[PDB]
Structures are given as C-alpha cells and as structure tokens.
Design a binder for these strands. Structure first.
Length: 330
DNA sequence: GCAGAGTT
DNA sequence: AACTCTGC
C-alpha cells in the first residue's frame, strides 16, 4: 500500500522511461510484495486455478529482468514491526462489522516460509543474489541505494521514500503503464519535500505504520504542512495543539480557508505518535557493505525446476528462455 | 455546502 | 459503478 496519495503528489517529478533505460544498472527488487499478492492464488485458467502462481510470476519477471540486462538484488521481508501489526489489527477491526490471532500468523508464517524456500531455490538456479532483510525489505533496499551499492530500486511502494531512498523505478512489471523513474533530488528541488516532510505526510495520509485523517488527501496534507511550518515533527505538534484549542468552545479572527476546513476533520486522541516517525527514521537494516556477484544460469536445473513446479517440457521452458540467453552473450 | 472529478 | 477528494 505504502502512503495513500504519495505517488499522486510525486508524479510531477517522475520521468517516463523505456524499459531499455534500466539496461546495465544494478537494482534492488522487493519480492515480499509479490508473495503477499500470490498468497491465496488466482483461478485464471478457463476452468480451474494455478498451483504455484507466485513461482510462475517470479519466473516471468526474472525473464523480463534478464532480458533488459538488469543485475537484480532481491530483498526478502523479515519480521514485522510492532506498529505494522497494530495497524493491520486496526484495519482488520474494520471487517465490515456493524451492529483467533495466534492461529493466523502461525499459518501465514509456514506458508510464506515455504514460498520463501521455493523462491530462493529458483533465484539460486538463476544465479542472482538475494538478501534476507531483518525486518523491512523496503528499508533494506533504501539503505543499499544510500550506500551507493545499487543504481536504484525497482518497487511500487511509495513508503520506500520514507526510508531514505534516492532512485526508484516504478511500474516496471506493469504492461500498460509506462515505466517511471523518480529521483529524490528532483522532487526535493521541485516540491520542497525532504524525508521529514514525507514522514509527516505519512502521519496525515496514512501508511502501514499508522492510519491517517479520514478526510485528508495529499492536497489537504500539503496545505497542513505548509500552514504549520517547522523542523522534523514540529508541524504535527503545532497542528494537534491548534486543533485541540480549535475544538474548544469556538465561535473568527479571519482564519484562512484552510483553517476553516481543518476545524471540521477529526483527530485520533493520541495524535501524533512519535514512534511512527522513529520507525521511519531509524529502522532495522543490514548496515553491512556487500560485494554482490551474479552467476551464470544453468538450463538443466531450470528445466527440472520448471517441470517440477509447473509441468513444463524442455521445449517450452527453452522457448520462454530463448530471448534471455540470446541477450546474455557478452 | 454540492456536485465535478479522479480512482479501483 | 461505488468511493472518496476537493474547487466551485
């Protein structure tokens, strides 16, 4: 999910790009969102469903990555931060209800750990390196972008910006939507957004770490952050103070139309929660400096894997592998 | 405060 | 087509 309307606000800075512009670059790829999407499969066959669709999509996307001379570093999620789980609990408390938590995590754990073993097997056969992030994989990609270990990161999760990412390629594994390239420098110089502003935007709009303010979108959020200017987390403190005294027997000394609009919307009794900004500023990553290597694939292991998990014969796997090996010449 | 308008 | 955000 990421941040609610962050991509809408940032889109003025992005640059449309042909997939051949990623040729040659080393890039990290968050895979844990692919497994969380092919968790319970899809019935796309004209009469039935697929067995291991996560492996199938992984294979197709590995083929597309190698077709464009990309050198990917896959990053797997680790544990979930406490705030992520609490927000997934409060977003599950709205289960369409009007007028069993210890057996769901334990099933998700083992099912996703088997998906992990399968995916890592396929990645090893393709000779591409991967890393098990300690908690968050988007922060683990951001720390690689910052340390100049990658030329960017392929992801659609806007929340990576809040972890300090600098270069991002988005809509790459989308067919109809053009690939788009975003640089922190460009939208910093355009929109005046640094990391702290983006974190306050996550406070207002909502993310996996906190639910936002029900009325506000990116426009109202930017109007707020520009109406209470400050450093770091100060703007939200000023906003909370002003809103508490605003909802204190009021009756007006020419409040700006934005402040006429903000007295309406409601706030959580604990807003703001500095643990959110802390979890975005100082997350858990591998500070290690890596030396990544990309091995040559071997078609026999790949064909055995394809036959064991999808039931493909040599001439189908080979047909879907013809262009990849064609490009991998020098 | 209403409906135009962007999104899934 | 509903859901939601926001200029008029």
């Amino acid at each position: 999910m990421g941040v609610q309307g962050l991509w809408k606000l940032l889109e003025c800075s992005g640059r449309q790009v042909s997939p051949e512009a990623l040729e040659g670059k080393i890039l990290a790829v968050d895979i844990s969102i692919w497994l969380n999407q092919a968790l319970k499969g899809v019935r796309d066959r004209h009469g039935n469903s697929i067995e291991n669709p996560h492996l199938l999509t992984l294979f197709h996307r590995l083929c597309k990555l190698l077709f464009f001379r990309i050198r990917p570093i896959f990053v797997f999620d680790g544990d979930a931060p406490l705030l992520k789980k609490q927000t997934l609990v409060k977003r599950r408390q709205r289960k369409d209800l009007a007028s069993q938590k210890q057996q769901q995590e334990r099933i998700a754990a083992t099912v996703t750990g088997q998906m992990f073993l399968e995916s890592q097997e396929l990645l090893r056969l393709f000779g591409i390196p991967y890393i098990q992030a300690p908690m968050e994989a988007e922060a683990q990609c951001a720390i690689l972008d910052l340390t100049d270990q990658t030329s960017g990161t392929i992801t659609d999760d806007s929340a990576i910006w809040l972890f300090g990412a600098r270069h991002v390629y988005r809509n790459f594994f989308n067919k109809n939507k053009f690939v788009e390239y975003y640089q922190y420098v460009d939208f910093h110089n355009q929109l005046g957004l640094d990391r702290n502003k983006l974190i306050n935007l996550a406070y207002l709009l909502g993310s996996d770490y906190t639910e936002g303010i029900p009325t506000v979108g990116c426009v109202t959020a930017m109007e707020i952050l520009n109406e209470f200017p400050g450093h770091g987390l100060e703007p939200l403190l000023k906003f909370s103070e002003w809103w508490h005294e605003a909802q204190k027997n009021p009756k007006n000394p020419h409040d700006t139309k934005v402040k006429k609009k903000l007295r309406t919307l409601q706030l959580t009794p604990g807003f703001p929660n500095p643990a959110v900004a802390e979890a975005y500023l100082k997350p858990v990553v591998d500070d290690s400096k890596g030396s990544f290597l990309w091995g040559k694939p071997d078609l026999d292991k790949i064909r055995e894997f394809c036959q064991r998990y999808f039931g493909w014969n040599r001439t189908k796997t080979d047909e879907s592998l013809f262009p990849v090996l064609k490009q991998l010449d020098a």
